[PDB]
């Protein structure tokens, strides 16, 4: 399903007071957090729905007509209109604009607000993979005053937990600190509770909430529910995944000049010689070799592309040592057993994984993705299950399908004669590399092209005056490298390059 | 082609190099010709993209921003496009050879890198670096940019 997240924000003057006016009020900074969340969701999940409500405010807005409870936006895909609506209250005097058009001061029932957000959840006609609600305050004293309403509120919250709603609470700015557990000590749905101090901290996890992460993060689904055939009949359902996948820009949309309507496009194939109109059955494909213009149908081409049925044809076992690094064709894929169609597939898969790990060999297999495709030989490397220090499976157990190139996949290169160098120069390079050595992490970079693309997208979506500029991590720290090295490069250059070498020419 | 370039380490190093496609995807350079089934003529065939009806001068390109649609002219995108530099191939850093896994091998081709054609000192520097990296179990992180319109790349 999707994710249901509702940002629940008080309006009872508990967000307008500030420790100092140089620091953001508990209100406006929450607005910035929510807007950042909207942006991140736009980047990540279009199909999710998010809502924002206000309670304790003087007026109200909700179908249940529960007073002092005003929904600002309902469970919907994020929209720039919503974000700018928040922005009009974001920052200084944005809370003043709020007071002017919205106001606050009244009390509420947390039972009542829980009822309202439960109504919001019942409203959506779409399946939610998660039931998240986000509460913004620094204070639990309103219902910390009366025990009856507090008991009713906690009973309602337990009920909503029974419904599967996961309540989460944030530490908000307060001069007297959050001072937790005045009401909220066990009224929080938590999978791992570790907060019991007064927590004068003005934040709990607001840093990443404000952090603009740029990723799509599509939900997991197998790239192919293929069948692994050992010989012809020992077949198991197997799941194939692109454990990594080069992301690309969203395609452009054809819009009108004045109304920006998505333009319905149609490319008819027609006889220009007679001005008539053609049909798919009315044309024939051709390729001319030498004096012969060979004419075919496209279909005939498709069936001459038919070699093997979709599946896996095990071709044998080759030791992992027999693999050349430069023999790479296209990014590898992950292999996982599936019991959906073949039961016992996972037991056999585990047996094979352990055995290939022992004997240190790869199962070379003839692979056909789907019909009308020439099967390819691919090496399946037994991929272990790797768990981090947190025992989180960082590398799943399975197999690594690497594509084995064919004879033509290479290209003849105008090689050059082999030339050696002095071992002193080798030591110079070793020392220089040691100077410029750096620890590698998988997520160490982003595509600056796509980054600035999203930056521009956000700017126009927010109709900004000027876009934020994406930083290019891929740009080297030339000054830092010169600082690290010194004249080692000059020494090696004199060791190698005579004092007439043209750097480029 | 010959792709002459410079391996750039900091600013103090610049070595003329020749890196070509070693392993790559294959496909014929001659594609089909959809001709008529009756006169076997392609010139009689014709496609006609039609926008509704309007011409190509009534249309712009747009982009779906979440729930919202954004007008975005191609001139504006080119102006705001992050533009890198062409034929610049600099080194980004040095990380352990064990740190990297072939599971993250991107692209569809394998590029073998030589030094400049007939540059003895370039070959000497290349061999010295090769031996150093080999003895150190060492792999080099580099930024690849083919031309001005090329996207910058991070590769091993």
């Amino acid at each position: 399903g999707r994710d249901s997240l509702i940002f629940l924000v008080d309006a009872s003057k508990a967000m307008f007071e500030s420790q100092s006016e140089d620091e953001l009020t508990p209100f406006d900074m929450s607005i910035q957090c929510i807007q950042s969340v909207y942006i991140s969701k736009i980047i990540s999940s279009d199909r999710d729905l998010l809502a924002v409500v206000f309670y304790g405010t003087e007026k109200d807005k909700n179908s249940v007509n529960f007073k002092n409870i005003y929904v600002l936006q309902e469970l919907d895909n994020p929209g720039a209109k919503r974000i700018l609506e928040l922005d009009q209250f974001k920052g200084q005097q944005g809370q003043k604009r709020f007071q002017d058009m919205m106001g606050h001061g009244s009390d509420y029932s947390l039972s009542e607000v829980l009822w309202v957000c439960a109504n919001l959840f019942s409203d959506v006609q779409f399946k939610m993979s998660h039931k998240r609600i986000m509460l913004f305050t620094n204070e639990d004293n309103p219902h910390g005053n009366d025990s009856a309403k507090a008991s009713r509120a906690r009973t309602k919250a337990g009920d909503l937990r029974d419904t599967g709603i996961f309540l989460d609470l944030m530490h908000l700015k307060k001069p007297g600190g959050f001072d937790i557990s005045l009401f909220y000590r066990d009224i929080i749905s938590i999978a791992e509770d570790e907060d019991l101090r007064v927590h004068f901290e003005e934040s709990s996890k607001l840093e990443d909430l404000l952090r603009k992460v740029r990723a799509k993060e599509t939900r997991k689904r197998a790239l192919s529910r293929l069948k692994l055939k050992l010989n012809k009949d020992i077949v198991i359902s197997v799941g194939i995944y692109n454990l990594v996948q080069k992301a690309l820009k969203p395609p452009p949309i054809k819009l009108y000049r004045e109304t920006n309507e998505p333009v319905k496009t149609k490319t008819r194939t027609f006889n220009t010689s007679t001005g008539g109109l053609l049909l798919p059955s009315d044309t024939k494909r051709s390729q001319i070799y030498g004096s012969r213009q060979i004419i075919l149908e496209k279909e005939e081409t498709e069936e001459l592309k038919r070699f093997d049925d979709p599946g896996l044809m095990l071709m044998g076992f080759k030791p992992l040592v027999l693999l050349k690094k430069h023999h790479y064709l296209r990014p590898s894929l992950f292999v996982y057993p599936e019991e959906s169609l073949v039961i016992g597939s996972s037991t056999l898969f585990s047996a094979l994984l352990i055995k290939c790990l022992e004997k240190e060999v790869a199962a070379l297999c003839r692979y056909t993705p789907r019909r009308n495709i020439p099967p390819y030989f691919v090496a399946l490397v037994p991929q272990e299950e790797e768990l981090d220090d947190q025992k989180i499976q960082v590398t799943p157990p399975g197999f690594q399908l690497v594509f084995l190139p064919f004879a033509d996949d290479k290209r003849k290169m105008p090689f050059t004669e082999k030339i050696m160098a002095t071992p002193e120069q080798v030591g110079k390079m070793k020392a220089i590399v040691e100077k410029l050595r750096f620890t590698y992490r998988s997520d160490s970079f982003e595509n600056p092209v796509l980054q600035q693309h999203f930056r521009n997208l956000e700017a126009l979506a927010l109709d900004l005056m000027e876009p934020e500029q994406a930083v290019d991590l891929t740009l080297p720290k030339v000054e830092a490298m010169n600082k690290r090295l010194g004249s080692l490069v000059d020494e090696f250059k004199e060791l190698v390059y005579p004092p007439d070498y043209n750097p480029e020419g | 082609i010959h792709w002459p370039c410079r391996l750039t380490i900091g600013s103090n190093l610049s070595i003329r190099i020749a890196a070509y496609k070693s392993i790559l995807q294959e496909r014929v350079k001659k594609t089909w010709t959809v001709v008529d089934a009756k006169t076997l003529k392609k010139e009689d065939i014709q496609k006609e993209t039609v926008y509704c009806e309007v011409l190509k001068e009534d249309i712009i390109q747009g982009f779906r921003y979440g729930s919202d649609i954004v007008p975005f002219s191609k001139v504006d995108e080119e102006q705001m496009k992050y533009k890198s530099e062409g034929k610049c191939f600099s080194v980004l850093g040095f990380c352990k050879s064990s740190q990297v896994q072939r599971r993250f091998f991107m692209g569809n081709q394998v590029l073998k890198v030589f030094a400049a054609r007939d540059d003895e000192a370039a070959a000497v520097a290349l061999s010295s670096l090769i031996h150093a990296l080999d003895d150190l179990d060492m792999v080099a992180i580099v930024r690849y940019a083919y031309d001005k319109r090329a996207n910058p790349q991070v590769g091993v």
């Binding site: 969701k41 992460v213 939900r219 100077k435 050595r437 160490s444 991590l473 690290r484 | -």
Partner: peptide, 23 residues
Amino acid sequence: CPGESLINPGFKSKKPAGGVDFD
């Protein structure tokens, strides 16, 4: 939940991008 992006439930925590860090 530990080791999970609270922004994207069912998705692991997203580290800051970071860059080259010489050793």
